[PDB]
Structure formats: C-alpha cells, structure tokens
User: What shape does this take?
Amino acid sequence: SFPKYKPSRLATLPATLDPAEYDISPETRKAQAERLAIRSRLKREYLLQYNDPNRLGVIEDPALIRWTYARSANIYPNFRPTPKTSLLGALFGIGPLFFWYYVFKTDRDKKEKLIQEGKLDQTFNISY
Amino acid sequence: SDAPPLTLEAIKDRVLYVLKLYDKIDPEKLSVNSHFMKDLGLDSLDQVEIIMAMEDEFGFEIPDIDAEKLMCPQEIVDYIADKKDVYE
Amino acid sequence: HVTKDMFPGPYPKTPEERAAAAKKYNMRVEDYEPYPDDGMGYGDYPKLPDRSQQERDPWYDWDHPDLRLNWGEPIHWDLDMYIRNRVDTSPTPVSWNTMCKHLFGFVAFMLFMFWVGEIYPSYQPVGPKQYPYNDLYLERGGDPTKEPEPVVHYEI
Amino acid sequence: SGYTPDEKLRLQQLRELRRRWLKDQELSPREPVLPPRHSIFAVTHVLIPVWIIHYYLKYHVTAKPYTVVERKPRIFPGDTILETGEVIPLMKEFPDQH
Amino acid sequence: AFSAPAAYLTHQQKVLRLYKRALRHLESWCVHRDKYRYFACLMRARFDEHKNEKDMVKATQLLRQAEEEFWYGQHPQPYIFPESPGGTSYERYECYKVPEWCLDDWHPSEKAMYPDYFAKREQWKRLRRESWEREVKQLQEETPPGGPRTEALPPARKEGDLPPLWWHIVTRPRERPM
Amino acid sequence: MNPFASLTLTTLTILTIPIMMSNSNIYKTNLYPNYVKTTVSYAFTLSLVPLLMFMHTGQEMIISNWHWMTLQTVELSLSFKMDYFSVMFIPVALFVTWSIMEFSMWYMHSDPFINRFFKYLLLFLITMMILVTANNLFQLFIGWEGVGIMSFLLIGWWHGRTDANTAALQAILYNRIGDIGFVLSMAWFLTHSNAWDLQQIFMLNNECPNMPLIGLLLAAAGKSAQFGLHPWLPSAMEGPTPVSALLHSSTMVVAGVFLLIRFYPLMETNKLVQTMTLCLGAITTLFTALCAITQNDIKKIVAFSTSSQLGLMMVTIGINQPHLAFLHICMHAFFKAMLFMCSGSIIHSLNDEQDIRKMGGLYKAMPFTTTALIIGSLALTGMPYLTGFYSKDLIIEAVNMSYTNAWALLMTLIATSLTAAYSTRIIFFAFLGKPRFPPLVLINENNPLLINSIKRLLIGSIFAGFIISNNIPPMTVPNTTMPLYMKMTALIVTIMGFMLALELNNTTYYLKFKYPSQTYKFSNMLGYYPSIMHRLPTYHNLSMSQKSASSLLDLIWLETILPKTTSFIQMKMSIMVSNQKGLIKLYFLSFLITIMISMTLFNYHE
Ligand SMILES: CCCCCCCCCCCCCCCCCC(=O)OC[C@H](COP(=O)([O-])OCC(O)COP(=O)([O-])OC[C@@H](COC(=O)CCCCCCCCCCCCCCCCC)OC(=O)CCCCCCCCCCCCCCCCC)OC(=O)CCCCCCCCCCCCCCCCC
Ligand SMILES: CCCCCCCCCCCC(=O)SCCNC(=O)CCNC(=O)[C@H](O)C(C)(C)COP(=O)(O)O
Assistant: This one.
C-alpha cells in the first residue's frame, strides 16, 4: 500500500515495524519477564551500594572489567592461525607496505631521471 | 529577567483552566481530586489528549509511561511540581 | 573483588559451557550467543545486537545517563564505536539505499552538467580586450631588450 | 491503569522529602558571611600602549633596514614633489570628446 | 522516567502511543492551529472507527498497518520540545549539576560562610545515617527469595520510616542548578 | 614617524590587555564583560583612523618588527600586512564584535560563566586579527588554527551536552581536512619559492603551477564550508547564539575566501584553479540555499543562508573579481550578524524556542525586532540602494558579463531566487499569522543593550554600502554596457522567488493534507549527506582501527612473528635438551658416536 522501508546496517529496522513484537507466544512473554527479572536484580544490587552512606570510592563493575579484558588480554589466547586469519593478516599488514613502496619508488625514479637529463626547473630551490 | 518563580498555586490554576476549556468536561462538576475515568467518564484515547494539552500549556514533554497514570488534576500538578522543583 | 572465574574464557564447545558463560555474563542462555569460533580472538564474549547507544530509550532511568548503560549489564564489544558521540545506527525516515541513490545521482548529475557547461561556455558578443603598448609587453614582465612583434589596434 | 496505592504513597513521601530538601537549599539573610577617574581608562588602555609602540617602532624597529616598507605614493600628472620640487607634465592634450 | 518499566507493553498501550505520536507528527505537518484541530478530529475519528474491535488478530493487523502508514507518512523534522531528548536544550544544564558530596571537600574557610546551610546539611546527613539499616531490613523482608521481579520500590510502611533508597532521588541537584 | 604603523599595531595590541587582566580582580567581578566591550569599542574607534588615511592617500605598509628565527637562507619574522584588505576588514570586524558583545551582555546574562564567555569571544577576535593581518604563511597558519580552536571551545560551550561536543569535534575534523591543503601549500611554497612571506611568493611565481593553488583551494573549502566539507557549519549552531552571530556567520567563516583573496595575484594566472573555484562556489551556493527553504529551526535557516553567501563569494573569486568578493564579505557581515541577533532576540523572548512552527504573530508583539529583521532580509535580497546591493548585484552582473561555465551561471541565478524564497519563509512563519507559542507570554524587548546593539548594526545595514563604495578607489573595470534584460536580472529573479515562495506559503492555510514529495525529503534532510557521510566512512574507519590495526596486526600477528615464535622455539628446544632420564648407558653411547664423528669428520681432513 505504501513504499516499504527496508533496514540496513547503519539504519536499522524500527521496533514498530518489527513483526516479532506482533506474534507473541506465552514463551515470548516468559522470556521478557525473565529479562526484566535479570535487569531488576542488577538494578537493586547497584542501588544498594549506590545509596549506602558508608561506602566511599568507586563501585567496581564486573561488566566493564570483562569488556576491557576481552578487548585486550583475552584475544591472543583465543587466536588460531586459520586461512581467513592468515589471509587477512598478510593482506592488511603487508599489502599496504609494498603498495606504498611501489608508489614512492616509481615517483622517485621518475624524479631522478628528470634531474639527470636537466629538465625539472629546480630554480630557487635553496632549501631542502 | 527570565521566567518568574512559578509556584504550586499557579500550576493548579493553569491545569484547571485548561481542563475547564475542554468541551467534554463541564466546569461546575470538575474538581481538583476528580478522577478522569470514574468521575468524568472519559476513555483512554480522551485521556491522551489531556496529557498533550498539558504539555502544550507548560511547554515540556511528559513520557508515555509517566503520562498514562495521571488521572486527576492534583496528580498532574504534583508531577509538574516534581519536574520543575516547585516546593511552594 | 572479581574472582578469576568471572573473566572471559575460551569459546564454549558444549551446551553446559554455554550455560555457564551466559550465567557469567548475566544473560539468559536462550539469549546468549558467542561470536563464531574462528581464530579472531573473540572467545566466549557475547555477541550483542549491533545497535548504537542512541537507539536506546532516552526516557529510561539509566545508571549512566550519558552512556545509556546499566551497571552490571553486558557491554557490546564495540561500545566505544557506538557511544553516540560517534557512529549512529538509528532508523531513518528514508531507508538506506534510497538516500544513497538520490545523493549519488545528484552529485553525478552536477558533475556532468558542470563538464557540459565547460564544453559550451557562456560569453558576450565582443572581441578581445585591447591593450596599447605592445599589449603591455614591458609591464607584463619586461625583457626590454627584445622589441616584440607589433600588436596593432585600429579604430572600428 | 494509574498508580498502585503503594506507588502513590511512596511518591507522596518522596515528594515531601524533596520539597523539604529544596526548602533547605535556601539561604539566610546573613548567609554570605564574608570575612574582613573621569577619563582614566583612555590613558591606561590607549595612550600608554600607543606610547610604547610608537617608541618601539620609531627608535628600534626602524633602526634595521627594510623593517617598515611603505607602498610608493601615487604620482599624477600635475603633482608637485616635496623633495625635488619637480612638476609632472600634464596629460597630453585630451581628444576633448564632450 | 520516574515509573518502573514493565516486561512489555499491552495492546492498549501500543495503540495509545501510536495515537500520541501520530497526533504530534500531524501537528508538525499542520503548522496552524485550526488546520491541526480539523485533521486531529479526523484522526480521532479514524481511531474511534475500530475502538471496540474484539478480534485480536484483526486488531493487531490494523495496528501493524497503522504503524506502516505512520513510518511512511512521518515528518522527517518533527517538532521537539526544547528540553526533550532530541531538542535544542536537552542536556544544556548538565555541566552545572554538581553532586552534593563535593560539599564535603570544601575548605573550612569555604564552610565558614553559610553556617546555617551546613548545620542543616549535618542534620540531613544524620537523618540519612540513622535510617539506613531499617531501609535495608525492609527491602530484604519485602522482596522474594529469588530476587525482585520489577524495579518498583516499596514505600515506608511504619511510622518513623523513610522509603528505602531515597537519598539520591531526594538530593537531586536541580533542573536549573546555576 | 607617520602614525599609520603605530595606530595599526596599537589597534591589535590593546585587544590583548583584557586577556592579561584575566587573573586580576576585575575578572572575578561582574564588570568584566562591560570592560571587554569597552575595550573593543575603543579599538574600533582607533582602527577608524588608518582607514581614513587609506581612503585619503591609499597608504599601505608592511611591518616586520620581530625576527623570530632564521633557517639557512629562509628568515621567518613577525610581519603584518596593512594593505587595503586588512585596514578595511579590521574596523568592520571590530564594529560587529562590539555590537555582539553588547548583545551578549543581555542574551547570556544568567550564565554563571559569562566572564569566561567574554574572554573566549575576545580570544577569537585576537586570533582573527592575527589571521587577517598576517604577512607570511606561518603567522597566517597561527591565526588559522587559533580561530579553529576558539570555534571548538565555543561550539561546545555547554560541555555537558553530547550533541554540542559532537558538533565541536565535527568542526575540528572538517577543518583538519582543509588544513592538509594549507600545509601542502606551505611545503610547496617553501621548497619552490624559498619563502613563506607574501612579497617573495608574488615575485617568484609569475605563472603559478596547479598544486599550491589546489592546496589553497582545499584549505578555503574547509574553512568556508563549501559543498565537499559543508555540513559542519549548520551543526555549529549547537553553540550559544552570540557565538553563531560572531564566528559562524560573519567573521570566522570568511577566512577561506580571505585566503584566496590574499593570493589573487597567483590565481590570476591559473585558469584551471579559477574554474574549480567557480564550480565549487556554484554548487555550494545552490545546494545550501536549496536545503534552507524547507528548514524549521531559524538558526539552521540563517546558517544555510550564510553558507550560500560564502558560495557566492567563492563564485565571485572564480571569475577573477577578488575585490568584489572582499566588498561582499564586508557588506554581508553587517546584515548577517544583525539577522542572527534578531533570531536570538526571538528565541530569548520565547523561552529558548528555535522552531519557527511555534513562533506566531510577532509583527506587532516585537516591533523593533520585526523592523530590524525586515531590513536585514531586504539587504540580503539585494534590494536597491541597501548595503547588500552595492556588492551582490554587482556580482550577478559580473557573472553575466564573463566567460563563465554555463551551469555555474544557471546555478547562481537559481540560488539568487532561493535566497528570497527562504527570507520569505522566515518572515512568513515567524512574524505573520496568529500566535503558536505557549500561552504564558514572556515577550519583552525593552532592554537598552539589545536595542542599541541591534540599532548600531541596523544603521550599517542601510548606509555602509553607499559609504564604503564611494570611498574606495576603483579596483576594476566597470560593466558600463549591458542589455537591459541582463541589467535587471537579479531583481527579476529575486522578485520571482519572492512571489513563488509567498504563494506556496499562503497555500499552507488551506484545509488539505497530503504526504510530502521525494524532493521535499531530499531538501529537508540535507541531500542525505550527513545521514550517509557521517555514518559510512566513520563506521568503516573506526571498525578497521580495531578489527585489523589493533587486533589482527598489533595484538595477534606482530606478537606471533617476533616474540611468540621465539618463545615457543626456545621452550621446545629447552624441553628437548633437558629431557634426559639420567641413564649413563644412553649418553656414554652418545659419547661413542661423538668420538667416532670427530675422528673422521674433523680428523680425516686436516
Ligand atoms: C525569469 C526567467 C526564468 C523563468 C523560469 C520559469 C519560471 C519558473 C519555473 C518553475 C520553477 C520552479 C517553481 C516551483 C518550484 C517547486 C516548488 C514545489 O511546489 O515543489 C513541489 C515538490 C515538493 O512539494 P511537496 O513535497 O508536496 O511539499 C510539501 C509541503 O509543501 C512542505 O512544505 P514546507 O514548509 O516544507 O515547504 C517546502 C518548500 C519547497 O519544497 C521543496 O523542498 C521542493 C522545492 C524544490 C524547488 C527546486 C527549484 C530549483 C531546483 C534546482 C535543482 C537543479 C537541478 C537538480 C537536479 C537533481 C537531479 C538528481 O516550500 C518553500 O519554502 C518554497 C519553495 C521554493 C519556491 C521558490 C523557488 C524559486 C527557485 C526556483 C525557480 C527559479 C526561477 C528563476 C530561474 C532563472 C533562471 C535564469 O517538488 C517538485 O515536485 C518539484 C521541485 C522542483 C524540481 C523537481 C524536479 C524533479 C526531480 C526528479 C527529476 C527526474 C530525475 C531523474 C534522474 C536523473 C539522474 C541523472
Ligand atoms: C502524520 C501521521 C501519519 C499517519 C499515521 C497512520 C496511522 C493509522 C490510522 C488509523 C488507526 C488504526 O488503524 S487503529 C488500530 C487497529 N486496531 C484496534 O483499534 C483494536 C481495538 N482497540 C481497542 O479495543 C482499544 O480499546 C483502543 C481502541 C486502543 C482504545 O482504548 P481506551 O479507549 O480503553 O483507551
């Protein structure tokens, strides 16, 4: 009836256009209640320390610790040399170096062969 | 300077003014503690329009979860006072 | 205060391992989903929906209002990419690819018409502007010891 | 639909506490207890700076060559020079097309 | 932002939110008040046309088609209240909100001014200290063994009791702190 | 010594005195903003004298006062150029800054950090003067980056707001993209011409090559927010309204055009760069005006208006009329600053509301604001004999009387029509009709600071064009001969835009509702340029900075090749060497093998 909206990676599907929020099973409602319970216990655990008069300092957050540890120190122990990993490493790490080497070497070879035959107009080029 | 220090009585006056300007609710019957459903026989759809009218009157937006509950003019006045930090 | 068993570990091969990982990350086992087990180093860290922080409800009472996060909840692997000072993935009025076609078409059309206007320029029905002293030969750089070719302008 | 009775009661107690706190954020009459010319502006902000800069430019900056270079003054036919007293000849018998 | 969320929104809540959102966007399209009143009455009639439908499948399908209508017909630049999440004054005064615990670090010369304010603050601190254990006890007794299902908090049920977890709600900085 | 040099230097020097008092017992007093405003007014009065000297005898000067350092044959010294452009632009900027500071004394009255705000405004003015009077490229770069840093600090003035910080970093990013071109021009001019100073560069480049001029054009596109790097200027309205009136409308954003004007002797000789500049200006002046006509925030409309006027200045530069572009800079400053002031007055009187859809009939409720905004829109539209007319109408004729790209000419005329269109939109939706604001009316414009500050710019918006045009020496050849239909074209297209926009606006009163066109969506959402260019490149860059640069290379493969391989090999070798059970029967047999090898391998060939 109308031009349809299709989601993308950087422009996602809205909640009101998502068919999941319109085909609800009892199991879906049970899952939503469980999610609310998990969020609620975490909220209560946070607010108990937050409101505490005695507490002085920073409340330590295990989720933040897990995030930073996973982003730095958990990566190498969970690495396996695979054809995808090997190919991506070789390309992304080696290819730019030889690409730039080729570009710069070509440009400098042209410049030197121009200097050799005395056709560059290097006049007023005192500083280098 | 800027806007005057709005008080509790002013909030109540403006809420009742807006309500009395609503054709659905008669002025004599309406009271500060009147329930919008039991007292005035108003549907859920009708209630939404009152909330939007209050937003337009006071120039701020009330969230939907907060908005549905408000069923009396006193409740609206208390909500607005809590938001604007009005203590008299 | 955090023991060693609270830290992320290896990818979970079995359902029991998944159940333990979901418990560790404070999630439902039906919701928990690790990154695919290639050698990229993700391990058992949960793969969360790739929504940005701007998409979350601004009328909720977040523990961290600016970041729209709740204390103790699992954090998306790319949180610093999605902090809403940065990449936004919010739904738009016009769908993606609808905007790309219009923008690219407009820019390509403008470039093509600028090239065409360069091919067919606009000008006034006049001859060249005339300058007296050998077309200001001495003024436009000099070389007084050359005596250039007479450029001669006659009345019309 | 609407507040539950416990919700409304909690809101009422919190509202009384908040109003008392906001009332307590008020200051007493004494509360900030602190512990124990006509044209002067135009000389300390204009005359003094222009004295230092003029002294600086006249006797220090112009001591070095080419430090202050001025565009050569325009000369027109009929002008009289203040240096040599030379008179520039006039502009060659206009066609007088009027 | 003050009420605890529920596990989900019911059908009635969804249709009401759609009604409010569509009315706001319609007002964005219809700048003038008379035209807005006209088309808003038409919108209300269109909503009332199916007010008492009892086929939940049909009601859900109608709500879904209404959502699809709204998304295509929404204003790309809807009006936003200045202090609302998308507005031009949303978090403008957050740089001026300073937590009250900072007052504990004032130099005694700073506290020498405002003696009455700091005496009142000492009374408030004593009140907060004296009622913490009762609030913790109330929370433990009231809540279920598994844990709290919802983020709703209980009121004070005895006489000399304060509602549990009240200090940070009560001692909010301000909406115009400076 | 003649007073020209002393007065020009003192004008800039006295602006720094209130900065040296930022640690004195005036900066903690509520009289500091008035002190800063008075200093700027005195500086304006002092700068009026060298301008008189130039109007009398055309006096120009360069002052190389402090020798900073010498690198080989290159000498860098603190030098100021006091030519026509400098001595004409300094008093205009000081006049506008004086008006805007007097306005800010009222607009920002309740801000707890108004003293800091005034010093920040003053800091920006100092950096802009450094940019404008610079005689070498290094001092120009100093001013160039100073104005950018001040713009960053003033856009994100409310630093608790995420959107303001996002906008400030966006401004820095978009300006660094053009800083690349600035640095390219510096490197080229230093190597090829052996100097950073303007005089040497002019001598040694009789026919300038492409690369330095393309670098300069990239820098100008970045600073003046042309089509490639345009979106930062509209987002810069996150800052307080006086910041928008001073930096992002009339003074700071003209720095790219000023840069290309300073290098007009070299641009006179390169036809390709002039064509590129003209095309960039044309597409900018059309695209931004097209976006402006459907905007609802009043500051956004004025921001797109100023971006379109900057595009027009760039077009004027592209047809080899630098003095006309400078004249339009000076004219545009007056009425654009006053338009932003009127917008700020409306916003303050309506409790910080910026959407025109909630501004009703203010024609009689704010009569002085209405008069000022009407006069400003008429000046902006090229109404005859106003300040806007003495430059803009001369520009449109110049494009019509030139060897010009045809598409650029068409785009410029269409943009001229759209200017009147969006001026009509502002006036119609803000001042005509019936009130649409909340019922508690707070409208009050009877503050002497507001009235005087606006009136001072109102007088300029009327008389400055005629005063300035009749006192500058002729710097070009006039277009004395035109076809009549080509003389009246600017007025004709402006009136056409006026009529069409007014008719389409009156159409909104009818009781019909229809869904918008795709063209309206394209215009209102800014060609979808921010929705695409602020999401795709940022996402891909930030994703590669972690997936490969940090994880794949730094944390995995660079570890794997050098240290992890070494550790693994040494561990394996250690285990192999040390895993002997200690049975002498095994290693005495080993000894026998060793002895036998030695006798034949090393002994049987001596
Ligand atoms: C003097 C000598 C010369 C005489 C010339 C002849 C006389 C004039 C001729 C006619 C000129 C146009 C007059 C009407 C303009 C249109 C206004 C209008 O009603 O819009 C209706 C409609 C939008 O209305 P809506 O969505 O219903 O609006 C809802 C509400 O009104 C929403 O309300 P709102 O509050 O949001 O308001 C919306 C807003 C306006 O709403 C919009 O946003 C749309 C307005 C677009 C106008 C565009 C005009 C200029 C366009 C230049 C573009 C260059 C080419 C770009 C091509 C890109 C291709 C990718 O309203 C306004 O503020 C006023 C609008 C502007 C009025 C004044 C315009 C003056 C400038 C144009 C005339 C110039 C005359 C002087 C020329 C002299 C030359 C020497 O837009 C159109 O349909 C037409 C727009 C014009 C261009 C459309 C072209 C089709 C696009 C696709 C083509 C196919 C491409 C295929 C692919 C190719 C790939 C290579
Ligand atoms: C610019 C705007 C874009 C256009 C937007 C397009 C939106 C679609 C227009 C038409 C709307 C619909 O289809 S209407 C949605 C279709 N389905 C139903 O209506 C089911 C029956 N509803 C009930 O029974 C409830 O009671 C309720 C009615 C909510 C009242 O509740 P209260 O009385 O107890 O508050």
